[PDB]
Ligand SMILES: OC[C@H]1O[C@@H](O[C@H]2[C@H](O)[C@@H](F)[C@H](O)O[C@@H]2CO)[C@H](O)[C@@H](O)[C@@H]1O
Ligand SMILES: *[C@@H]1O[C@H](CO)[C@@H](O)[C@H](O)[C@H]1NC(C)=O
């Protein structure tokens with residue numbers, strides 16, 4: 136895609152800290168950028184949309200290449216259009232924002248400079264942040280996660296992408312998403328079909344795969360952390376239902392693990408650990424620590440374990456133990472993942488796509504920090520916060536993931552009932568294991 140000039144692109148500032156062993160930290164002058172899929176796209180030199188609602192203008196966009204040549208991404212009004220505000224070390228995302236149009240959700244990336252994403256290298260480090268999920272109901276997900284995107288959003292690979300990271304190009308994730316309007320400097324008009332339940336979305340013939348470490352997928356009721364490996368760790372364009380992932384005829388048919396190896400304390404058998412008034416009390420801000428432990432204790436070792444700690448009201452809270460017979464421990468390891476998938480009768484493509492070692496291979500490439508707020512047009516967030524599938528019995532291990540009702544989370548309802556839901560991420564810190572909190 137091209138660069139539009141109607142609206143200048145100015146990235147809101149957001150600081151974050153790099154820490155050393157001992158706990159000393161230095162502040163980085165980061166800034167955030169909205170994903171290109173949220174932007175106004177118009178014909179170069181004009182105001183006519185290339186895409187409107189969930190359909191393309193096929194005169195301007197008769198094929199993927201001509202469309203990329205003819206269509207320009209515009210700058211964003213972060214607060215007024217998208218409900219995105221930042222101050223100091225804090226980022227607030229609102230769910231619905233009405234301007235001339237009704238915007239729903241957002242997806243933001245952390246930048247190093249105005250043309251380049253920040254590339255985090257998490258092996259043998261911990262990533263820590265504060266969050267306020269107290270305004271997130273059933274059916275919404277404030278996500279903070281990492282994907283193996285290119286640092287320049289694909290500019291240097293794809294000359295037909297003139298916009299790059301400055302305009303939030305280059306997204307990919309372990310669902311191999313086909314809802315992206317531009318992938319690899321090509322539009323996705325070919326094969327496009329509108330969503331039956333999202334007036335703003337559709338899918339095209341191309342998808343964008345890469346590995347994904349889900350640090351945080353949460354609302355006030357449930358949370359989960361989940362590595363998703365792929366055969367290739369970095370961005371790859373896939374075609375058609377062979378992409379696999381959510382929204383394909385077979386989520387398991389492609390090169391990425393769509394499910395991941397997850398740890399949700401409630402799903403792992405503790406119903407009183409995370410939630411309103413619980414050990415980790417979602418009625419107020421808390422700190423979330425996530426550690427990427429390697430086999431040899433160095434940054435070039437193989438990923439062996441992912442650990443989780445919380446801090447709230449100054450008390451350090453270790454992750455809850457998984458309580459199911461034969462699925463023990465309080466962290467993610469290969470033995471946990473194998474045992475958990477067996478007990479829960481979930482297809483284990485985690486190992487097929489490389490397991491923790493494969494996840495680590497992605498971590499070693501460098502990964503982009505994503506902060507988002509979304510509702511779920513496939514599964515109504517029930518996989519996170521309810522019984523899933525909704526036909527199954529809550530007494531069966533793996534089915535119950537939170538206390539939300541099985542008829543919660545339908546996007547039309549969420550969008551009607553919770554337009555002023557929001558999430559606040561703040562106080563990001565990265566450094567050696569134990570360096571960001573009162574360890575160990
Ligand atoms: O596609 C929705 C999310 O799925 C999450 O994986 C689920 C499955 O969908 C279930 F079938 C399975 O029993 O449990 C796993 C874990 O909750 C996936 O982790 C997430 O990335 C997807 O958005
Ligand atoms: C839930 O986790 C908390 C904190 O670790 C613990 O105090 C409580 O006993 C746990 N419940 C179960 C059923 O293990």
Ligand SMILES: [Zn+2]
Nearest residue numbers: 180181182183
């Ligand atoms: Zn015109």
